[PDB]
Amino acid sequence: GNTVTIDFMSADGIVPGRTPVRYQGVEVGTVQDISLSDDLRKIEVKVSIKSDMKDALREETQFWLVTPKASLAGVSGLDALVGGNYIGMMPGKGKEQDHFVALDTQPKYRLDNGDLMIHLQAPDLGSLNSGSLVYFRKIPVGKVYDYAINPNKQGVVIDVLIERRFTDLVKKGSRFWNVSGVDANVSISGAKVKLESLAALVNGAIAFDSPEESKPAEAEDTFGLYEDLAHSQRGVII
Amino acid sequence: GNTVTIDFMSADGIVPGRTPVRYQGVEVGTVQDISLSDDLRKIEVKVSIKSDMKDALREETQFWLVTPKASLAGVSGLDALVGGNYIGMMPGKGKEQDHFVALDTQPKYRLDNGDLMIHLQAPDLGSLNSGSLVYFRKIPVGKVYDYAINPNKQGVVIDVLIERRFTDLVKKGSRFWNVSGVDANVSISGAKVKLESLAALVNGAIAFDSPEESKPAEAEDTFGLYEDLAHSQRGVII
């Protein structure tokens, strides 16, 4: 039980009843009070944090509000059936600190649990949301972690998170393609519309290939994200 | 704990149990009583507001009822799963005041959080609701704040709210277009119906472009809202 003041932009989904401070999915703190400061729409939020984290609480502790994913219940308007909000934290070396400014978005993935963190470069985001799923042989072996525009305004950098035991799958010569939405073709002498993937419709997905003989890729290696399976066919440009 | 009387038109969704006064998303007050005044269907609502806001409570304090967004659950009829109502406030210089007349709609966005507040001119509203989403490279970088008919009866002015870090994207030579609803084409020698955007179907959306070399637009600069991506193609009129 302590008093930690964090300044937010907008007070949406933050209740003094149940709004936890989930450090790595662990309920550490609990929001106690929400007060307002009139300058620049400043929102002073008082939070009671446990004792061992309070000794770990230092100046380079990044707070950010966490909002639920873009879901079918979020677009339908069922605000009582989606869930609730929380805030996340990442402490650093810093100094002793009580007054904190919250961050606008999620920080970069820094911890090393064995998982692989590679970047994909697409001309636009497509149907991919944060939390969309990554397939190999239609088996979920990871998920899209974040997305951000590169300093040139042309592209979008989408960085994914392959699971630890599946890092062997990713090679230097892998090609990643986009499988999201439904494509229905009306063809001559029969129009075969087959529905293969149901989870990719609502949220979006990325599949990938693993070549035979190549070194396993690592350490934020970039990849082009092709828009379709037919665009990711190997071959020789003529 | 105080007594503040506000006059409303219709008493829908206002319960003495839980109806807060959300100033900038902060639960400041709580509705205590709903009584009726017979002239012109006047509804006197007694509200208990906290002490510091009561010292901030002055004559130029605009009150308005807040109703949930036009959603799929709002059109389906699930009145128990959408949510609840509240009222919002904006205090001004004014004078000491107890008796307030509520406002019919949301006031104009006056505060400066760094966000950008620009106007769009469309011949009709289209599928856009208040709270529909604004995309750049299919990344949500803002939302539609309000919509209102301009003094000439021809057009609708839709003013949107670009986020603070994405203000660099908007230029003077930007073109905004409408991506809302589904368009399904049946074409010769194959009919490729591809479903790209799921969130735009229920609520509506506006995408935009950023040109290469132009000054960044600011300070409520107007823009034409094209109805489709093909209508917002650059080129030379012949």
Can you walk through the features of this model?
The structure is cut from a larger assembly and holds 2 copies of chain A (238 residues). The first copy, chain A, is mainly beta. Chain A has 2 domains: 1-107, no CATH class; 108-234, no CATH class. Helices cover 6% and strands 35% of the residues of chain A. The first copy, chain A, is built from 3 helices and 15 strands. The first copy, chain A, has helices at 51-56, 72-76, 199-202; strands at residues 4-8, 20-23, 26-37, 42-49, 62-66, 86-90, 99-101, 116-122, 133-136, 139-148, 156-162, 176-178, 183-184, 205-208, 222-226. In chain A, the strands form 3 sheets. Chain A has a 7-stranded mixed beta barrel. Chain A has a 5-stranded mixed sheet with strand order 2-3-4-1-7. In chain A, strands 5-6 form a two-stranded antiparallel ribbon. In chain A, a hairpin with a 4-residue loop joins strand 3 (26-37) and strand 4. The N and C termini of chain A lie far apart (69 Å). Strand 13 (183-184) of chain A pairs antiparallel with strand 13 of chain B. The PDB classes it as lipid transport. Keywords: lipid transport, bacterial cell envelope, MCE, YebT. Lipophilic Envelope-spanning Tunnel B (LetB), Model 1.
Q: What is the strand arrangement across the widest sheet of chain A?
A: 8-11-10-9-14-12-15
User: Can you write the helix and strand succession of chain A as a string?
Assistant: EEEEHEHEEEEEEEEHEE
Per DSSP, the total helix count of chain A is 3
> What oligomeric state do these chains adopt?
part of a larger assembly
What Rg of chain A, in angstroms, do the CA atoms define?
22 Å
Q: What share of residues are in beta strands of chain A?
A: 35-45%
The structural domain count of chain A equals 2
Shape of chain A: elongated
First-last Cα distance of chain A: 69 Å
Biggest β-sheet of chain A: count, sense, barrel?
7 strands, mixed, barrel
Largest interface comes to: A-B, 41 and 42 residues
The beta-strand count of chain A equals 15
Helix content of chain A: under 10%
